[PDB]
Design a protein around this ligand. Sequence first.
Ligand SMILES: C[As](C)(=O)[O-]
Ligand SMILES: C[As](C)(=O)[O-]
Ligand SMILES: [Ca+2]
Ligand SMILES: [Ca+2]
Ligand SMILES: [Cl-]
Ligand SMILES: [Cl-]
Ligand SMILES: [Cl-]
Ligand SMILES: [Cl-]
Ligand SMILES: [Cl-]
Ligand SMILES: [Cl-]
Lengths: 232, 231
Amino acid sequence: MKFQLFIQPKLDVLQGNIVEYEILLRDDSAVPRFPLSELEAVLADEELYLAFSEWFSEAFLDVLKKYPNDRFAINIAPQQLFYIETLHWLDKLKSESHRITVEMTEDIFDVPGHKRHLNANDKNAFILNKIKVIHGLGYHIAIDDVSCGLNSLERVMSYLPYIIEIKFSLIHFKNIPLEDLLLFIKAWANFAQKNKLDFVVEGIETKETMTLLESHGVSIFQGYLVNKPFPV
Amino acid sequence: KFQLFIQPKLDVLQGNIVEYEILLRDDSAVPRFPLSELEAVLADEELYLAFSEWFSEAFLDVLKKYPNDRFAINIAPQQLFYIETLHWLDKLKSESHRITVEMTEDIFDVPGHKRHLNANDKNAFILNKIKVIHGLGYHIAIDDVSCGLNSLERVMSYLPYIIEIKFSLIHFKNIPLEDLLLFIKAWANFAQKNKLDFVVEGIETKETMTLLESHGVSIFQGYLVNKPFPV
Ligand SMILES: C[As](C)(=O)[O-]
Ligand SMILES: C[As](C)(=O)[O-]
Ligand SMILES: [Ca+2]
Ligand SMILES: [Ca+2]
Ligand SMILES: [Cl-]
Ligand SMILES: [Cl-]
Ligand SMILES: [Cl-]
Ligand SMILES: [Cl-]
Ligand SMILES: [Cl-]
Ligand SMILES: [Cl-]
């Protein structure tokens, strides 16, 4: 209803090649924005979540068909994993998982009501299990926006068996002096290397910035330029 | 079915008591944090009122017993959606000048009457309550940074109102210390740049301190590992 898909090509900072396309939810707005309140309303009702899920999986499959040679990243909030429908549509798209990355978002949404009786430890176990399942289906799993939301180092550590990628988004950290932010970037870069994970830095304004990040010992990673998403 | 423990916080280098932390425990043969019980209380306003009345009175008894010392209490951000929480912080406010509110990294379910708020409006509502607590003169610490929801983004959002950030080695057993040390150094610098106090908890012994120093963790309060006990 109030929903549509956008794509953001993810462009390598140094040579500008398209590494993958990320899929983004947007509203039907004058100027489309992420539909935060609408997705939360859907997440709070199993029947609406089922309709949303049917829409999303079909629309996304249409995109996969239209670009059959490329990798697609989709965003899934951990709280989505409390609905079996989420895993059911990942299962139905599983012939394409070799070219799909599931970016687990940093979002803290209200847990669907039929799983609210679980304590905090049992909730984390349930989610980790579902991440196991997604990994088992052969999706690449990435942690999105690390050091944001609930994507703290502890969480990244719990997900670690099942992930291939850590993403750090400069955009989420505007007001931190870069020389201060650089120490967190260096920490995550080293973590990624030690654990044979790909490290991605998103929201890099120019190649100038790359070199900037380059002096202060961030050696191995993929950088993505800032660019506007657009309708699919 | 709840009781309070205290954990004296002991300086790693000279062993003095910096402050005492108040910890919730159940009535078990071996007491543990009563996670399920506290979540059930958080899910029901009437039980939360009754728990709040118990807690605040019990904690006030403690304060009277040790009138010269600083006490740290843990508050989960979701407790801020209940007006009762600010009501008892308001009632204890004559002592706020020796109380630290440690905002925990917990992700509990938000009380039902505030679930209608979108994620942005929920964050603003918590931030407003933290402003209030800071306004009452409490010291506010962020507990267990880089755990739970206490990510760098959150710490940034809390920043005007905090004086302390705490990093707990205990939460990160399986990270090789030379890798963990880069995160510790990042937070140590963040604290200095922002004139926050940096605390590293869960230091087993004095050698660790040298390590921390050799890797740019210059100014911090180290705390030893020790057992809490009934108040
Ligand atoms: C070329 As590929 C590893 O993104 O499927
Ligand atoms: C010396 As003090 C501010 O920790 O009571
Ligand atoms: Ca993403
Ligand atoms: Ca604490
Ligand atoms: Cl999205
Ligand atoms: Cl379900
Ligand atoms: Cl973090
Ligand atoms: Cl506690
Ligand atoms: Cl660990
Ligand atoms: Cl320091």
